[PDB]
Amino acid sequence: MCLKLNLLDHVFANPFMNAAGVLCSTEEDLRCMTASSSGALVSKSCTSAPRDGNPEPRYMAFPLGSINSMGLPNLGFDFYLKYASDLHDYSKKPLFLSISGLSVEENVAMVRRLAPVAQEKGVLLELNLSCPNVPGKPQVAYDFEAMRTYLQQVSLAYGLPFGVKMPPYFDIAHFDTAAAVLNEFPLVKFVTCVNSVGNGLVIDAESESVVIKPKQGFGGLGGKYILPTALANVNAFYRRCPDKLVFGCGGVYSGEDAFLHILAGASMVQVGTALQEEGPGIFTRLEDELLEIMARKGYRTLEEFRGRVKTIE
Amino acid sequence: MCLKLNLLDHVFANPFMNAAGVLCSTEEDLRCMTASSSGALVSKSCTSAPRDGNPEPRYMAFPLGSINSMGLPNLGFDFYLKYASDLHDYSKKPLFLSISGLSVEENVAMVRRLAPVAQEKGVLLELNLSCPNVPGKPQVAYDFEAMRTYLQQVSLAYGLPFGVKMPPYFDIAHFDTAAAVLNEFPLVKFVTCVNSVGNGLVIDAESESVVIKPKQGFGGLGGKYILPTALANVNAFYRRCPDKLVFGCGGVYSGEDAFLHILAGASMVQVGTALQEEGPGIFTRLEDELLEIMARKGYRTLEEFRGRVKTIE
Numbered sequence: 001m002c003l004k005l006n007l008l009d010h011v012f013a014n015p016f017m018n019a020a021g022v023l024c025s026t027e028e029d030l031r032c033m034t035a036s037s038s039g040a041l042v043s044k045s046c047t048s049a050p051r052d053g054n055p056e057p058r059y060m061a062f063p064l065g066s067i068n069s070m071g072l073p074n075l076g077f078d079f080y081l082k083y084a085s086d087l088h089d090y091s092k093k094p095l096f097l098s099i100s101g102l103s104v105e106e107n108v109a110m111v112r113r114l115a116p117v118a119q120e121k122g123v124l125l126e127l128n129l130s131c132p133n134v135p136g137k138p139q140v141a142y143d144f145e146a147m148r149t150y151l152q153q154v155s156l157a158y159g160l161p162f163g164v165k166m167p168p169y170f171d172i173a174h175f176d177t178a179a180a181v182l183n184e185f186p187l188v189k190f191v192t193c194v195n196s197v198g199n200g201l202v203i204d205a206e207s208e209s210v211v212i213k214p215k216q217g218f219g220g221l222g223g224k225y226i227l228p229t230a231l232a233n234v235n236a237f238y239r240r241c242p243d244k245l246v247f248g249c250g251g252v253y254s255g256e257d258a259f260l261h262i263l264a265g266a267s268m269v270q271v272g273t274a275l276q277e278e279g280p281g282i283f284t285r286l287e288d289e290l291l292e293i294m295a296r297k298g299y300r301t302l303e304e305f306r307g308r309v310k311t312i313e
Numbered sequence: 314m315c316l317k318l319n320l321l322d323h324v325f326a327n328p329f330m331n332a333a334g335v336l337c338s339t340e341e342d343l344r345c346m347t348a349s350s351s352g353a354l355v356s357k358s359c360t361s362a363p364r365d366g367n368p369e370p371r372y373m374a375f376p377l378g379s380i381n382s383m384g385l386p387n388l389g390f391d392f393y394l395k396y397a398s399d400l401h402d403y404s405k406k407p408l409f410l411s412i413s414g415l416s417v418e419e420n421v422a423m424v425r426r427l428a429p430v431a432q433e434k435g436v437l438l439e440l441n442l443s444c445p446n447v448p449g450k451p452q453v454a455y456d457f458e459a460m461r462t463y464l465q466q467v468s469l470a471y472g473l474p475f476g477v478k479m480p481p482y483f484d485i486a487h488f489d490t491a492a493a494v495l496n497e498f499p500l501v502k503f504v505t506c507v508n509s510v511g512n513g514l515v516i517d518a519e520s521e522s523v524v525i526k527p528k529q530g531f532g533g534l535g536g537k538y539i540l541p542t543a544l545a546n547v548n549a550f551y552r553r554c555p556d557k558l559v560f561g562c563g564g565v566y567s568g569e570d571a572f573l574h575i576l577a578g579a580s581m582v583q584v585g586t587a588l589q590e591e592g593p594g595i596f597t598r599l600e601d602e603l604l605e606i607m608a609r610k611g612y613r614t615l616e617e618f619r620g621r622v623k624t625i626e
């Protein structure tokens with residue numbers, strides 16, 4: 001009875017990892033994520049130069065989830081690269097590194113220099129496609145030319161296995177169009193569904209005011225709010241992309257939540273809001289809880305039920 | 314103190330109404346809503362010809378909301394017109410008739426016939442833009458060129474003030490694009506944000522099965538999952554649409570949920586999932602609660618705080 005996985009030519013103690021941006025920005029966060037019992041970790045999405053991100057308050061959590069416009073605060077690509085190559089203990093867990101450049105050019109520059117470290121050290125690229133593109137156009141994944149463009153360019157630049165990180169979609173034509181694009185590109189070996197549910201609005205009834213400062217209080221949503229949306233996307237992409245791995249992310253608080261992800265077709269399972277709110281000690285609970293469920297049903301390995309969600313007659 | 318208002322040359326006792334879909338398909342349903350305390354009511358979206366809809370189960374509710382792929386079951390537009398025409402008691406409350414034909418032609422056919430009654434009776438048109446096409450192309454609203462056609466054509470054929478049911482958007486550029494489309498049309502006197510959050514997927518851990526039968530489990534989401542998304546859209550369209558009313562829909566379970574909708578700029582506030590789950594008694598509760606919040610804060614009229622959410626700094 002176990003949680004172990006082998007994929008992307010790496011061995012994982014379990015399927016649990018943090019979500020990009022959560023408890024991963026600093027050498028402290030990273031070391032801590034490593035000391036945790038997560039199966040893997042991923043580094044805060046990075047740009048070429050260091051960033052301050054947006055004004056505070058910019059994250060707020062609630063019984064039902066969280067809202068954010070961090071604005072991509074991060075220590076700059078050089079820091080995350082030195083971490084991959086010099087600092088991270090790969091004997092503990094695989095490292096993923098997440099890049100979120102503000103243009104296609106910026107993203108090519110980084111992967112060119114990552115590629116040698118990716119080859120030698122084994123760190124794995126999660127390209128963040130829910131990244132802003134020219135103001136007045138939709139974020140990259142909502143713009144299927146920009147996405148085709150970004151992936152040709154990065155593929156050529158990097159020439160190695162890597163995954164992408166997708167925003168949620170809500171039409172079938174959007175699921176159909178998005179997977180066909182990703183299918184064109186044989187080096188995209190995993191797909192992470194999903195990023196935050198874009199541009200929600202949280203209002204406080206007592207103060208009659210928005211709760212985050214940037215973007216008139218408009219921001220990305222996660223947590224309990226988004227689980228169904230996250231499970232739909234995972235299962236949609238798992239069905240449409242059989243030569244690729246889907247990584248599940250969206251409202252995981254419990255073993256059960258992760259079990260549903262895995263049932264939908266998830267291979268790795270990421271925690272954002274819940275992790276942010278509960279702390280790295282969440283990972284041992286999640287493991288135990290999933291394992292208790294597997295036991296109740298006599299499941300002995302993840303593969304016994306991944307993607308095995310049933311439909312109705 | 315009371316929550317009376319005047320919109321679109323009609324008086325409402327309060328700002329509450331069902332959402333299209335809920336408690337409004339049969340003549341029983343409509344007599345029921347008319348006998349409720351709702352300020353108004355809206356008919357199940359209809360097509361030219363009666364529809365059986367999708368295989369059951371096609372709707373499910375859980376503590377955090379609901380999922381549906383009804384597939385547009387309705388008695389057919391001839392029945393709803395007769396109800397508008399000979400049966401509804403206008404002394405009791407305003408009626409709204411919702412319309413969701415499969416083609417722009419199907420919609421042009423219904424509205425021409427609806428205009429003489431709208432003039433004669435005062436019934437209000439809510440065109441549903443979450444309708445087919447196709448498959449192979451996104452719903453009308455997620456497709457800004459079709460939306461402009463549909464509006465052109467209906468605007469030409471109806472020629473009276475009418476309103477529009479909008480799916481949720483998740484990106485600023487879409488909010489901008491969407492709004493500029495609806496602003497083209499001086500006849501679109503009101504917007505209803507939002508319709509269900511498209512294509513979520515609820516899975517049941519015990520049976521390891523999806524919960525609605527249509528579309529391999531995939532269907533629209535309502536309830537407590539969708540409130541901030543509904544509030545992002547009410548607010549977003551209130552700012553961009555200064556000559557239109559905004560109607561709020563999504564995640565209303567309480568006076569506080571309605572209050573938040575009004576703050577974002579809502580004039581009418583709609584209830585679907587809660588109404589489905591609690592019954593029309595909900596309107597007296599919701600009234601009391603909102604009225605209590607108002608009394609506590611020192612507000613006398615809806616106009617005092619509509620659209621008045623505070624941003625930070």
Ligand SMILES: Cc1cc2nc3c(=O)[nH]c(=O)nc-3n(C[C@H](O)[C@H](O)[C@H](O)COP(=O)(O)O)c2cc1C
Pocket residue numbers: 019020021022044045059066067068070072098100128130165194195196221222223224226249250251252270271272273274276
């Ligand atoms: C504070 C915060 C920062 C985030 N930063 C990133 C990021 O830098 N790159 C990225 O791809 N996703 C980022 N995300 C998205 C999360 O990784 C995840 O997709 C989303 O929050 C849903 O996860 P959850 O619902 O389990 O919280 C961030 C989310 C939060 C709340």
Ligand SMILES: Cc1cc2nc3c(=O)[nH]c(=O)nc-3n(C[C@H](O)[C@H](O)[C@H](O)COP(=O)(O)O)c2cc1C
Pocket residue numbers: 332333334335357358372379380381383385411413441443478507508509534535536537539562563564565583584585586587589
């Ligand atoms: C069972 C059901 C049927 C619905 N039918 C329609 C419909 O015919 N036309 C429409 O515009 N919206 C329809 N809706 C959408 C609702 O009117 C509303 O936009 C959505 O459910 C969010 O509101 P809620 O959170 O109060 O449930 C339906 C929703 C449900 C749950």
Ligand SMILES: COCOc1ccc2ccc(CCc3c(C(=O)O)[nH]c(=O)[nH]c3=O)cc2c1
Pocket residue numbers: 021045068069070071072073100102128130131132195196220221
């Ligand atoms: C070019 O101007 C930069 O300003 C912004 C504004 C909003 C942003 C939202 C998300 C992000 C990037 C990555 C990210 C973030 C984040 O760092 O804000 N938050 C998320 O919930 N998901 C994410 O993928 C950058 C932004 C930059």
Ligand SMILES: COCOc1ccc2ccc(CCc3c(C(=O)O)[nH]c(=O)[nH]c3=O)cc2c1
Pocket residue numbers: 334358381382383384385386413415441443444445508509533534
């Ligand atoms: C052309 O084939 C018709 O089959 C479908 C399939 C999915 C549909 C989804 C929504 C709807 C329409 C109206 C509607 C419905 C509904 O009747 O399913 N449910 C909602 O939550 N919101 C709605 O606006 C019709 C569908 C018809």
